[model samples]
Target: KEWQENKSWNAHFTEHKSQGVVVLWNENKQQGFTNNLKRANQAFLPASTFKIPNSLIALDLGVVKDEHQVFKWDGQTRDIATWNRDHNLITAMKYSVVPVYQEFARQIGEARMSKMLHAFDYGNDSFWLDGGIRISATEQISFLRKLYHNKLHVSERSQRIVKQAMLTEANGDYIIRAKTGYSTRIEPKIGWWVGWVELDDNVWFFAMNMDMPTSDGLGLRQAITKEVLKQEKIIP
Candidate 1:
């Protein structure tokens, strides 16, 4: 508990006019910090954060060929401008292209997807978009812990490809590999930011989710997370 600074984390959430949960695990010391432990244990729809596991399964099953294989645009403009063009694995993840991933899911199908989810022990179902798949903040961190250490049941190459796609930012001081998820399909929607940070000596895995009353809550997921990370001196 010496490392937890809940007051500061709480302030960040309060500043955003929302209450949420954040779970941070410091792998080097096997220590943890949380804003709300009970909330962290409560499950909710995964939204696109399922991309982490989805990418793993896709790569493991050879459905994606490799990160270099292209998922051509279907010639239909989407809400997100970046999705309007062709994308390979890394680009699709970077842009969070829903249709491409949906295509991946359709190809991966139900039974195998369920089997992989069981192997990964992630959530209750394989269909991440809707099919009642849910995971808690704590569960998100657990999945990431295995991913960070390449301990999941997927192939090493597949893990490497997915992890590579997750890299969002990097520089001399640190590297951040993360994914953001938002689901408007559910009432009071859900926003998520789940991933890890790599420093010279240790890695910190974190998972956060908050109620999204509207589309305005989109980036708050990363905002609150970056604030907490800043408070912990994890990033500048």
Candidate 2:
């Protein structure tokens, strides 16, 4: 089977007090794993995961200048303490600072965002937090696959920069690049972990999402994804 379900994968969801779905796609072999086929195909709001394409779009459009360019914080304290301070591209992405990216969106303007997101096939609308755009786990991988190979509509350098910004873990043998998203805009709420792993010459792309009734489950999005990756031996 191209997609195999592992018991431990579902167990990760149970431990998190919620159920979720995962889809891992091996680029070279054209096969991988999934715990639920139906949920894998179901779409949900992208939330901060929109940063992937947003990063690319911003760079391609010269919205922020480059990855190291800093955006000064407005000195208005937000609920999240980290966001109250200044952040460059990588730090903004690492902290998932909504305001920082709202600044990006503001600079990008709706017209260009609409044009680029269409090219990225990342759903419609430039207002990312308005609950109008949706992407499924399966489609996330499709987009990621293109991104992994530098085949998206954006320039290769922009893709490379965003990919680097996604870096979560790295070692001599493998490196994990990912983005986490939590959206409270919709009922039932949604959490997402989407990205890929690079091991040797192989690349494994994955997308995962879970329902979160409270913010406590936000971390579970990445937890479940990492657990599944371990259970499948994609990462040590």
Candidate 3:
């Protein structure tokens, strides 16, 4: 009764020949599945889902003084124009700016980051942005589930602050907060969309990802996730 798997997404991904996973969890119960359950549980490059942990570590360690701390652009143009501007933690998170968070990691440094990951029991206890950290959809949901209830060992202030930063959309009925992650350095580009929806006080956590080799593939990560959440009535 604690877990369930729904495979109704056959048509959605079957058309793409791309494998993926979706896991949704909350306090009373949990349910979801991937094209392959074993694969869903196996750790892979975490891509930017590391930001969840990364953001928390930054706030807790005073690496960033607060949500509004400014990160000036280094004056180098990169793949995304949105990333080239000065960014505070919130905007950089909204843009998923790699350079700025890389700066955060540099300030925190690997040794302190190792201690933080150890304490958080983050995925595989690694924080190398060059793909050292690894996590599965299962672990992603587990971490978010804990955060949803403020059950993690970290300070509640830090948890709430990071949650506020994750907010992506909101309306009268539901508030959707999510983070998107992509890595093209690998053979097939990998992408992730993870977060939760809140209605009144109830929260439904979700995570989804796919091998998105092309630009359109990037959209599919969130597209497929929204489809599943709607199919399950997890969102409006």
TM-score leader: 1
Between prediction 2 and prediction 3, which has the larger TM-score? Answer: 2
Q: Which pairs of residues clash in candidate 1, taking residues 3 or more apart in a chain or in different chains?
A: none
Write one digit per residue (lDDT tens) for candidate 3, span 1-236.
25555666656777667778777766445545454566567676777777888888888888888889898999999988898889987998899887877877888888888887777777882243455677778778878877777777778988998899999989887898888988666555678888888878677777777877777778788777777777777676
Q: How far out, in Å, is residue 50 in model 2?
A: 0.5
Candidate 3, which ten residues in sequence have the lowest lDDT sum?
Answer: 27-36
lDDT agreement of model 2 with the native: 0.85
Candidate 2 lDDT over 1-236, as tens digits, reads 36766555777888866888989998889986788888898888898999998888889988868888988998888898889888998999999988878878888888898888788887533356664788899889989988999999888999999998999889987888999988787765888899999999899999998988888777777778888888878887
Clash count of each predicted structure? 0, 0, 0
Off by over 4 Å in 2: 1-8, 124-126
**1 or 3: which has the higher TM-score?**
1
Highest lDDT: give the candidate number: 1
lDDT of 3: 0.77
Candidates arranged by TM-score, highest first? 1, 2, 3
